[PDB]
Amino acid sequence: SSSLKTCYKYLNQTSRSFAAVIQALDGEMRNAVCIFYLVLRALDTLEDDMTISVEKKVPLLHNFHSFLYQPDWRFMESKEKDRQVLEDFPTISLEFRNLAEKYQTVIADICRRMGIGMAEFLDKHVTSEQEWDKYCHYVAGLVGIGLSRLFSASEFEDPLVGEDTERANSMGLFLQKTNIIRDYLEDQQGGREFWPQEVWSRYVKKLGDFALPENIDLAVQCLNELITNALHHIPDVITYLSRLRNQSVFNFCAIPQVMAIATLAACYNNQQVFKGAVLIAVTLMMDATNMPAVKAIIYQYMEEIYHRIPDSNPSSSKTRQIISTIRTQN
Amino acid sequence: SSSLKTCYKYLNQTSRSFAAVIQALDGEMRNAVCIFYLVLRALDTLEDDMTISVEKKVPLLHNFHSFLYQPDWRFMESKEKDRQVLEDFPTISLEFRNLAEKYQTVIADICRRMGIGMAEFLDKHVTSEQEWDKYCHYVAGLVGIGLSRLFSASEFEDPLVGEDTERANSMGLFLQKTNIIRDYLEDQQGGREFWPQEVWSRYVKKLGDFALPENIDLAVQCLNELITNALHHIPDVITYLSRLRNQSVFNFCAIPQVMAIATLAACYNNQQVFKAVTLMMDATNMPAVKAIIYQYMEEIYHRIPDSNPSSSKTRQIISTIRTQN
Amino acid sequence: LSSSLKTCYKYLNQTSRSFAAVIQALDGEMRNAVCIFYLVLRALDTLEDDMTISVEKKVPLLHNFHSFLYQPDWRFMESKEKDRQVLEDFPTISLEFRNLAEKYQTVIADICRRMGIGMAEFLDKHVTSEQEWDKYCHYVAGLVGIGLSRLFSASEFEDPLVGEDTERANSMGLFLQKTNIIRDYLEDQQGGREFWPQEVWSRYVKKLGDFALPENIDLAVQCLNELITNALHHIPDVITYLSRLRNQSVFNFCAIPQVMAIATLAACYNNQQVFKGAVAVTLMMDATNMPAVKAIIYQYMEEIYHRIPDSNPSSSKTRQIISTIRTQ
Amino acid sequence: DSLSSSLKTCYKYLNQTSRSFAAVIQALDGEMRNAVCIFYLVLRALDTLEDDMTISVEKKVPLLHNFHSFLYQPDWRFMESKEKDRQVLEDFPTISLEFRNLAEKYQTVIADICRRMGIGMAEFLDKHVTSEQEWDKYCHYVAGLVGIGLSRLFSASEFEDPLVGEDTERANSMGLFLQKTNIIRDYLEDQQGGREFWPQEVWSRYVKKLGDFALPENIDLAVQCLNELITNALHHIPDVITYLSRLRNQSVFNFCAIPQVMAIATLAACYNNQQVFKGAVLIAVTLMMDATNMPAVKAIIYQYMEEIYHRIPDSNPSSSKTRQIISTIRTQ
Amino acid sequence: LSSSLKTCYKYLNQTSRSFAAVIQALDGEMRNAVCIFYLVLRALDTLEDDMTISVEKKVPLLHNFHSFLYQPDWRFMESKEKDRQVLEDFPTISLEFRNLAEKYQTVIADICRRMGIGMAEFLDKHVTSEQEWDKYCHYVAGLVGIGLSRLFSASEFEDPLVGEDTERANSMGLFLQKTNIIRDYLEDQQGGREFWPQEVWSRYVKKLGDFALPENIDLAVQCLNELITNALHHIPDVITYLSRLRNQSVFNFCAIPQVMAIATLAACYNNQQVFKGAVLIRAVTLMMDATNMPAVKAIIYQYMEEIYHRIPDSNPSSSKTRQIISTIRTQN
Amino acid sequence: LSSSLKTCYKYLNQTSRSFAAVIQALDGEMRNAVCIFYLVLRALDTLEDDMTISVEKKVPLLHNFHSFLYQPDWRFMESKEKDRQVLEDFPTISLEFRNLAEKYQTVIADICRRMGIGMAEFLDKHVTSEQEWDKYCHYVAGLVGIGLSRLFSASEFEDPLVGEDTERANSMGLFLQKTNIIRDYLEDQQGGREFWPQEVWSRYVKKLGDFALPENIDLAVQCLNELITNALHHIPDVITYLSRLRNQSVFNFCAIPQVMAIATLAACYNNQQVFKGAVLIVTLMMDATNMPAVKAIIYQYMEEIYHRIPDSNPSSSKTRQIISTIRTQ
Ligand SMILES: CC(C)=CCC/C(C)=C/CNCCN[C@H]1[C@@H]2C[C@H]3C[C@@H](C2)C[C@@H]1C3
Ligand SMILES: CC(C)=CCC/C(C)=C/CNCCN[C@H]1[C@@H]2C[C@H]3C[C@@H](C2)C[C@@H]1C3
Ligand SMILES: CC(C)=CCC/C(C)=C/CNCCN[C@H]1[C@@H]2C[C@H]3C[C@@H](C2)C[C@@H]1C3
């Protein structure tokens, strides 16, 4: 099916750190997840295309889950790079309708529940940490639940995976925050903001001030507070990963999470996060293909952070509290 | 038996990218494969030895499979750097006759059919691509089959692995071609020409012309073409590895393949051949092996110049692997 | 989540940097038991390791150390070691130990006793004969292996046969100790104690502290090579032990230490930097599965084998042992 | 079909000599099959030599002592045997051929157990079993060693934990229990055969000739000796259980359990039974289970134990002892 | 080891037909815990059955039985039953009881107390309504089920769920208990003992003893089937319970009784022999035993059809008898 | 929970003498999948067997049977067999079929399509050569073996290799089908049906029905023993197939049927009762619940037949060879 070939071609084109593990999924989960990642990509391609007015965008987002069942629909007024998926959307919609109704259900549902949240923030900004969790819930949190629901529907993972929408939520919230925190600069030099105001407001006047050499010290302090915030999702991330019983599925969830921790440990109290690029011993003897190994890798990156925590740092007291919990817990 | 310790000694003196993983095999596969490797080595030592009259080497290759049953057979005229296995073959043949009879047949059969192939390609060079597969079969194909027939004989692996020889063959062809494709200069200073005639000739006059700088643009276009050919085997390699269920046997098969793909991804569209998530997971499980493969497929897919004549094929094939499922 | 429990894991990450990680990875009930088993042994060794104390008072403490686990107010403030926090704030450690299931309390309590005894036995004397070198390592490692081995079977995560194999659980420990000692020859010398079997170096130099003298580097290396060859004989038992484990978290905890050990002996063999300071397929597989561990081990056996000066008084010995491992 | 036809012959003799073992032996996994098959055949041919009384002692001894050596004598045979299982001796070259085809590590165990077993069998060619210590010594040579051999094999094939073969005393118990149970039931048969196996220091305190129990008038004293010996055997049960509880391979468990289970089943029927001296003896929650798992085996054993306890005559001079051991097995 | 402990297993085998073997086969601590729990329930039951004891003396004994467990010197010498041995030497069983882990004692004592109060309220009354028949079986069997379950969980050889779902555990007991009552109709009827729910057999005859009368065989059978159909409603829970078990020794302990109970029901269904002595306990069941859930379900369903193929239309329960069976079929 | 599904299991127990109890023991989805996969074959079989339906009317039904699974209102009232209840109430069966997961439907439907073409092929021709006897058994039993194997792999309960290897899956079916054909000789004879390969019985008699005549009993046994020897060759694959299984419930479902088959062949070997009616059937200490047991049981029966092999029997040699092969390797 050349139509299916095209999809995977776009997947590797719009997903450099997932296509590999996705195409490694067993049976049904493979095509399902592949498509699920293509629709969300197209949806994200819209919310970001600024060339589109809010009055014209909201509708496109609210009625995105509908374009799926409309064999002809396709957006051409996209100036983004991923526009390719929107223009040739019919191909994606074609495969989508080729999936079992079970998967069509979960996906379409997410695209709908997500198309609402995304549009909801097209006018406002993330203020409180609570509003930050809420945002991460629509753009990524749901993505976590959607998959968890596909793993249970595929019958490769016990029903509990898709039931505990909490962990599925924390899982996606951990990666999204790690991204938001890491991509601060580019997002700023991109004209967008994702950091919680009620947090950076206690350090500087505008969120963009962290892009100024004179506010580098304050930038790090705020950075550490947001990193300490994401560390709380770990307890759940660990618990979720320990419930998986399918290798292919584990490799799909484990790897991303492990790289999130590695990144947080590489960014913690690091000024490079505001200057340029930030690159990531018993951890050399293990790999993220089994639970006992992930934990060991995680616990290590934890001490790596716990060892660089400044006593002066305003959020140091908290940073240790959480790390101390992850150690003892279980 | 000291005679057994001697074999494992040559195994190390002869191997490197295997000796360790072979000794890791479980149960009787350990000895079977160890001996199976030594006999094939000695056979290959007689094939490469140039200080042997063609009208003296042919019989040796055609009858090497029989010397396994002769307690005192041996070769002394050899000058190769691995003549130790030939001079002290009785030691190897002895341990061969101690292996379960079910293994003797497999090893003897391959060694017999492989000796014939090598004798055939002594006065010839690879001409057509169809002939290239034939050569790789007599040197790497049969090897993949022999092992498959050994793993299923020991019951450590499903009987399917030893039956589908069409797949076990690809395992060998994929590794063989990989080596050949890269070892261009190596075999060029030795005097051998493994690259298929109908391929390089479609670019130059003599196969050694690629070594000349003013042909670097024709050499890289021929290189890429061959690499493309080898990439067609990957689909089978995945199918093959997907059937393995024994860990020790998996490490024995997977590791080589993964290492071979890594090579093609480093030689593709690279002139030096004439002069991300892979760091978070190893090849211990199938899902990982696939993931690793897919990544190397993109590394190559993200370096395919539209100017290269193979641009079409290379992509078409890579698209089939990523779509497979 | 008891604060005292957190205090323990905090001392674990302090007194350790290459074990704390895998220990916290242990499944369920083993996590705590083992973590604690490690701390109580830290204090027990901290005493013997402290010199401010006299053999006059040491013997008593060591012999009764195991009993202090049931005395909520016991603690030692008369120690100046980098590991004081475990002896001074011991009540917090023994407290959690008191909450460990009976099964675990029994095992640990036993090791501490048996260990303390023989540990006090070498407070003055040295390690003369090789057969004595195994006796010492048995008290400071062997039992440790038997302890962990008995804790795995107790938790039921490992087959009960794992606990019975006390002999291989011992060899499993002596392989780490011998390696640890052999490697830290310099520090131990620049500290005050001597562990190298007297009967071994005696026929090399009159004083074990001579191997630190440049004009003896030759005799030094030769002696080293002999000891390393002595330690390699434990490999067969090691491989057999790991070949029995069935739990992943347990395997990771037993395999890693063993791999790092061999990775050290292979780096210290015939190496002269041992008396001056510190020190392909491998990069393809992790020590997370038995077959991989084998490949790793065997691969190191070769890096040692192909570098055995045939002019060494142990070359013959070293070769046959690194041969029984291949054919094994 | 295009493989060893001599191995096919070996299994033919296996079914010819061992009617109630071949089935479970052929059920063994991997290398163990041939190893245990060839091992059982060499010991059967070695047993045939000892049993054949038409062979002088000065002639039989040299054969027993060097029997383990003939395993490497491709053309060695024996055509002067008059026993029924003489076939394995006349066509022995075929058996030794396959013996040399086994891993050289399996040959070591078999060859060794075969050697030491010959030494013992020779010792008891010019003497009889007097004391119990002597009785356990004989059974050791003819059974205790087979238990050790088989155990050393299981461990060698890595199918069973290295502890199985290492513990030679528990393996010895496995062999003694079966051998004794066998002798106790084979009394009448060995009496007409001219071979006495019962320990003198036991039946002597009852009669003057071991053949007296055959004479009906002494059936009462017979059942008394019969009960003392069974009580003697029951002391091997504690180890039989300890040994089985260590097995992890299913095929092996079946191979070791089934026999032991029938052994106890036999002693249970023979206990206080007079027919043991008149004719052959013969066979309820056990009907619900099968000897395939450890706990099931125990249940079967414990149930066969209680079927002997409420049978113990208060009179019999073994009362206290019989009940005593059955009270130890019954309380872990 | 302990002289007192061995005495317990000593009594266990003489007070337990075929149940001590399965118990003695249990793993770890469960072995001793169950042995004691079985004896304490034995004595308690021995007192309830002993008719020589006046209701005035029996009532206090039942209510205070659980407390005797902690009284080192309590014993009963007025018992006249045959299993009175546990009552006269109770101090021993009492001694070992205190040796068990505090957690196990709680269960035994609790089930012992609650069971005493129950047996005490039926001392003068007869089972009337079906609801009462359930009320009774709970006191003499249901609680036994709840008890054991809480013992397996405490030992951690099973999951907490087992000891938490008291309904499934109760059904396990009621099924076996009701089955015994349905079968031993005549036996107990020959002892003045009345168990059959009066509210049920009253729609057929005037007094339960009439089913023993030949001319009422037709009525007796219809009533028989009505009760059996009732017991069948417990199968769903029985299956659910057995499926949650993870320990082999524990499975064999629970599975065997249930299976053997279904076999009894299938054999009694529409059988006229139930009123003329004992009944004959009569496919794919032969090729397999009860040691794995799948086999058990197979054997169970097997007996389900047994009863199904024998359901006559003329029977008043015919319609609802197959209703429950058809339900047990679909429920995966 | 499901008035219809509850009816399916009602029919299962009806048409399934001794198979339902084991099928209802399967885990997860396999349970219903196999129950339905069985009922559909029960119907397709009831048609092929119905002799009151002309061939020209039967061929179309067998060829399109696989399509009726998607025709809700389809049924068959003309059936006169005794297992027609599934045909007259087929809509109730096809309903639950369409409810099965898609992965299961694909398999079940595919088998019917494949089996239909075959059954129609032998509607007017009698089995001739042994090579055709296998082909026929392939359509009636072989396909069922490959069918179930695909369901086990689809349900994820069995390794993907179980459903891949169709050669041994076929043997698992042929071994059972041949045992039935061999045993039910007199039952099929007294019904106007012949399954015994003509190329075979023709070397003993002039009419396959002559074996019913007492004066040919000796020649009948010789043919009987030959066919049995022919079926023994399938054992090697049966043991191989069983040794690949891992799920307990599946093992019981596959092992039990095979065991009873061997026991049946052992009771029928060189047994004259086969031509005069029906023949009834360590082995007590161990049951078919594990591979090792099954083997020992199989071997016990093998020796049972082997010990009764007449030296004069024109198949005695072959009878021994196969036994030795199963025995040794
Ligand atoms: C499997 C469990 C429990 C959680 C998944 C955790 C997880 C990958 C969240 C996605 N957060 C990254 C930002 N997501 C974006 C990328 C991926 C999808 C397609 C594109 C690009 C638009 C968004 C959705
Ligand atoms: C498997 C474990 C733990 C012990 C072995 C238990 C076990 C079979 C003892 C044999 N005791 C019966 C008498 N043995 C004889 C028979 C079998 C062999 C060949 C022939 C006939 C001569 C003897 C040796
Ligand atoms: C499990 C593996 C590998 C094979 C299954 C072996 C197996 C049941 C073959 C079918 N051969 C018996 C004749 N089958 C018929 C009966 C049962 C089904 C419904 C009715 C009556 C029509 C046919 C199908």
mmCIF file with all atom_site columns, C-alpha atoms in Angstrom, chain D residues 6-94:
data_model
loop_
_atom_site.group_PDB
_atom_site.id
_atom_site.type_symbol
_atom_site.label_atom_id
_atom_site.label_alt_id
_atom_site.label_comp_id
_atom_site.label_asym_id
_atom_site.label_entity_id
_atom_site.label_seq_id
_atom_site.pdbx_PDB_ins_code
_atom_site.Cartn_x
_atom_site.Cartn_y
_atom_site.Cartn_z
_atom_site.occupancy
_atom_site.B_iso_or_equiv
_atom_site.pdbx_formal_charge
_atom_site.auth_seq_id
_atom_site.auth_comp_id
_atom_site.auth_asym_id
_atom_site.auth_atom_id
_atom_site.pdbx_PDB_model_num
ATOM 1  C CA . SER D 1 6  ? 23.334 -48.532 16.005 1.00 0.00 ? 6  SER D CA 1
ATOM 2  C CA . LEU D 1 7  ? 21.662 -45.999 18.284 1.00 0.00 ? 7  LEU D CA 1
ATOM 3  C CA . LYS D 1 8  ? 18.332 -47.424 17.144 1.00 0.00 ? 8  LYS D CA 1
ATOM 4  C CA . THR D 1 9  ? 19.565 -50.850 18.202 1.00 0.00 ? 9  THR D CA 1
ATOM 5  C CA . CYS D 1 10 ? 20.553 -49.477 21.600 1.00 0.00 ? 10 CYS D CA 1
ATOM 6  C CA . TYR D 1 11 ? 17.019 -48.283 22.293 1.00 0.00 ? 11 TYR D CA 1
ATOM 7  C CA . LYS D 1 12 ? 15.766 -51.645 21.094 1.00 0.00 ? 12 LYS D CA 1
ATOM 8  C CA . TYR D 1 13 ? 17.717 -53.392 23.851 1.00 0.00 ? 13 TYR D CA 1
ATOM 9  C CA . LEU D 1 14 ? 16.625 -50.713 26.304 1.00 0.00 ? 14 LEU D CA 1
ATOM 10 C CA . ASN D 1 15 ? 12.994 -51.700 25.759 1.00 0.00 ? 15 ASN D CA 1
ATOM 11 C CA . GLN D 1 16 ? 14.038 -55.349 25.862 1.00 0.00 ? 16 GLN D CA 1
ATOM 12 C CA . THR D 1 17 ? 15.824 -55.078 29.202 1.00 0.00 ? 17 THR D CA 1
ATOM 13 C CA . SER D 1 18 ? 13.964 -52.251 30.941 1.00 0.00 ? 18 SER D CA 1
ATOM 14 C CA . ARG D 1 19 ? 10.219 -52.598 30.429 1.00 0.00 ? 19 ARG D CA 1
ATOM 15 C CA . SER D 1 20 ? 9.291  -49.925 32.991 1.00 0.00 ? 20 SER D CA 1
ATOM 16 C CA . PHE D 1 21 ? 12.047 -47.344 32.475 1.00 0.00 ? 21 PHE D CA 1
ATOM 17 C CA . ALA D 1 22 ? 12.532 -46.905 28.727 1.00 0.00 ? 22 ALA D CA 1
ATOM 18 C CA . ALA D 1 23 ? 9.322  -44.876 28.449 1.00 0.00 ? 23 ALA D CA 1
ATOM 19 C CA . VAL D 1 24 ? 10.523 -42.258 30.933 1.00 0.00 ? 24 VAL D CA 1
ATOM 20 C CA . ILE D 1 25 ? 14.165 -42.545 29.847 1.00 0.00 ? 25 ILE D CA 1
ATOM 21 C CA . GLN D 1 26 ? 13.267 -41.747 26.256 1.00 0.00 ? 26 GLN D CA 1
ATOM 22 C CA . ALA D 1 27 ? 11.330 -38.817 27.685 1.00 0.00 ? 27 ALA D CA 1
ATOM 23 C CA . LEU D 1 28 ? 14.567 -37.237 28.895 1.00 0.00 ? 28 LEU D CA 1
ATOM 24 C CA . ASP D 1 29 ? 15.618 -33.955 27.294 1.00 0.00 ? 29 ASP D CA 1
ATOM 25 C CA . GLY D 1 30 ? 18.587 -33.295 25.038 1.00 0.00 ? 30 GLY D CA 1
ATOM 26 C CA . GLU D 1 31 ? 21.870 -35.096 25.669 1.00 0.00 ? 31 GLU D CA 1
ATOM 27 C CA . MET D 1 32 ? 20.565 -36.859 28.782 1.00 0.00 ? 32 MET D CA 1
ATOM 28 C CA . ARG D 1 33 ? 18.577 -39.374 26.730 1.00 0.00 ? 33 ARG D CA 1
ATOM 29 C CA . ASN D 1 34 ? 21.449 -41.151 24.998 1.00 0.00 ? 34 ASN D CA 1
ATOM 30 C CA . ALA D 1 35 ? 23.677 -40.592 28.020 1.00 0.00 ? 35 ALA D CA 1
ATOM 31 C CA . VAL D 1 36 ? 21.246 -42.282 30.406 1.00 0.00 ? 36 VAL D CA 1
ATOM 32 C CA . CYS D 1 37 ? 20.301 -44.918 27.812 1.00 0.00 ? 37 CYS D CA 1
ATOM 33 C CA . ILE D 1 38 ? 23.881 -46.019 27.141 1.00 0.00 ? 38 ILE D CA 1
ATOM 34 C CA . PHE D 1 39 ? 24.609 -45.745 30.862 1.00 0.00 ? 39 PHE D CA 1
ATOM 35 C CA . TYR D 1 40 ? 21.724 -48.070 31.696 1.00 0.00 ? 40 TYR D CA 1
ATOM 36 C CA . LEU D 1 41 ? 22.832 -50.577 29.054 1.00 0.00 ? 41 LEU D CA 1
ATOM 37 C CA . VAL D 1 42 ? 26.477 -50.816 30.132 1.00 0.00 ? 42 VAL D CA 1
ATOM 38 C CA . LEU D 1 43 ? 25.364 -51.437 33.711 1.00 0.00 ? 43 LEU D CA 1
ATOM 39 C CA . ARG D 1 44 ? 22.890 -54.045 32.506 1.00 0.00 ? 44 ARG D CA 1
ATOM 40 C CA . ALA D 1 45 ? 25.599 -55.933 30.624 1.00 0.00 ? 45 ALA D CA 1
ATOM 41 C CA . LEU D 1 46 ? 27.842 -55.536 33.660 1.00 0.00 ? 46 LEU D CA 1
ATOM 42 C CA . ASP D 1 47 ? 25.027 -56.926 35.781 1.00 0.00 ? 47 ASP D CA 1
ATOM 43 C CA . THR D 1 48 ? 24.500 -59.866 33.435 1.00 0.00 ? 48 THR D CA 1
ATOM 44 C CA . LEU D 1 49 ? 28.101 -60.967 33.939 1.00 0.00 ? 49 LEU D CA 1
ATOM 45 C CA . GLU D 1 50 ? 27.821 -60.934 37.731 1.00 0.00 ? 50 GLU D CA 1
ATOM 46 C CA . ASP D 1 51 ? 24.473 -62.739 37.643 1.00 0.00 ? 51 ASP D CA 1
ATOM 47 C CA . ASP D 1 52 ? 25.534 -65.502 35.259 1.00 0.00 ? 52 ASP D CA 1
ATOM 48 C CA . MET D 1 53 ? 26.546 -68.313 37.627 1.00 0.00 ? 53 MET D CA 1
ATOM 49 C CA . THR D 1 54 ? 27.725 -70.551 34.781 1.00 0.00 ? 54 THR D CA 1
ATOM 50 C CA . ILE D 1 55 ? 30.960 -68.573 34.958 1.00 0.00 ? 55 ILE D CA 1
ATOM 51 C CA . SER D 1 56 ? 33.715 -69.485 37.408 1.00 0.00 ? 56 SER D CA 1
ATOM 52 C CA . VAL D 1 57 ? 34.766 -66.847 39.940 1.00 0.00 ? 57 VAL D CA 1
ATOM 53 C CA . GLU D 1 58 ? 38.426 -66.778 38.868 1.00 0.00 ? 58 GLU D CA 1
ATOM 54 C CA . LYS D 1 59 ? 37.149 -65.918 35.397 1.00 0.00 ? 59 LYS D CA 1
ATOM 55 C CA . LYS D 1 60 ? 34.358 -63.496 36.296 1.00 0.00 ? 60 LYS D CA 1
ATOM 56 C CA . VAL D 1 61 ? 36.487 -61.229 38.493 1.00 0.00 ? 61 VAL D CA 1
ATOM 57 C CA . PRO D 1 62 ? 38.919 -60.135 35.737 1.00 0.00 ? 62 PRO D CA 1
ATOM 58 C CA . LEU D 1 63 ? 35.906 -59.227 33.602 1.00 0.00 ? 63 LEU D CA 1
ATOM 59 C CA . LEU D 1 64 ? 34.254 -57.108 36.304 1.00 0.00 ? 64 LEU D CA 1
ATOM 60 C CA . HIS D 1 65 ? 37.483 -55.263 37.127 1.00 0.00 ? 65 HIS D CA 1
ATOM 61 C CA . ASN D 1 66 ? 38.173 -54.455 33.479 1.00 0.00 ? 66 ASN D CA 1
ATOM 62 C CA . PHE D 1 67 ? 34.590 -54.093 32.265 1.00 0.00 ? 67 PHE D CA 1
ATOM 63 C CA . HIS D 1 68 ? 34.906 -50.304 32.322 1.00 0.00 ? 68 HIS D CA 1
ATOM 64 C CA . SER D 1 69 ? 37.976 -50.767 30.128 1.00 0.00 ? 69 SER D CA 1
ATOM 65 C CA . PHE D 1 70 ? 36.186 -52.815 27.465 1.00 0.00 ? 70 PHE D CA 1
ATOM 66 C CA . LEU D 1 71 ? 34.158 -49.679 26.735 1.00 0.00 ? 71 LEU D CA 1
ATOM 67 C CA . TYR D 1 72 ? 37.157 -48.599 24.683 1.00 0.00 ? 72 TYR D CA 1
ATOM 68 C CA . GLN D 1 73 ? 37.675 -52.021 23.090 1.00 0.00 ? 73 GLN D CA 1
ATOM 69 C CA . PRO D 1 74 ? 35.610 -51.716 19.851 1.00 0.00 ? 74 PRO D CA 1
ATOM 70 C CA . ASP D 1 75 ? 35.560 -55.464 19.245 1.00 0.00 ? 75 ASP D CA 1
ATOM 71 C CA . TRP D 1 76 ? 35.082 -56.831 22.763 1.00 0.00 ? 76 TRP D CA 1
ATOM 72 C CA . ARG D 1 77 ? 32.165 -59.226 23.227 1.00 0.00 ? 77 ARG D CA 1
ATOM 73 C CA . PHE D 1 78 ? 31.009 -62.179 25.330 1.00 0.00 ? 78 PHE D CA 1
ATOM 74 C CA . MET D 1 79 ? 29.444 -65.284 23.805 1.00 0.00 ? 79 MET D CA 1
ATOM 75 C CA . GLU D 1 80 ? 29.743 -67.564 26.829 1.00 0.00 ? 80 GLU D CA 1
ATOM 76 C CA . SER D 1 81 ? 26.834 -66.015 28.747 1.00 0.00 ? 81 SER D CA 1
ATOM 77 C CA . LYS D 1 82 ? 23.677 -68.014 29.433 1.00 0.00 ? 82 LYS D CA 1
ATOM 78 C CA . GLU D 1 83 ? 21.515 -65.238 30.886 1.00 0.00 ? 83 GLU D CA 1
ATOM 79 C CA . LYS D 1 84 ? 18.495 -63.863 29.002 1.00 0.00 ? 84 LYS D CA 1
ATOM 80 C CA . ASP D 1 85 ? 19.896 -60.352 28.591 1.00 0.00 ? 85 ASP D CA 1
ATOM 81 C CA . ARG D 1 86 ? 23.027 -61.888 27.076 1.00 0.00 ? 86 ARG D CA 1
ATOM 82 C CA . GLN D 1 87 ? 22.237 -59.966 23.896 1.00 0.00 ? 87 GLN D CA 1
ATOM 83 C CA . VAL D 1 88 ? 23.777 -56.746 25.208 1.00 0.00 ? 88 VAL D CA 1
ATOM 84 C CA . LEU D 1 89 ? 26.984 -58.708 25.804 1.00 0.00 ? 89 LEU D CA 1
ATOM 85 C CA . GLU D 1 90 ? 27.162 -60.524 22.470 1.00 0.00 ? 90 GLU D CA 1
ATOM 86 C CA . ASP D 1 91 ? 26.409 -57.354 20.527 1.00 0.00 ? 91 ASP D CA 1
ATOM 87 C CA . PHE D 1 92 ? 28.197 -55.133 23.036 1.00 0.00 ? 92 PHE D CA 1
ATOM 88 C CA . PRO D 1 93 ? 30.437 -53.604 20.325 1.00 0.00 ? 93 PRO D CA 1
ATOM 89 C CA . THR D 1 94 ? 27.352 -51.748 19.109 1.00 0.00 ? 94 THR D CA 1
#
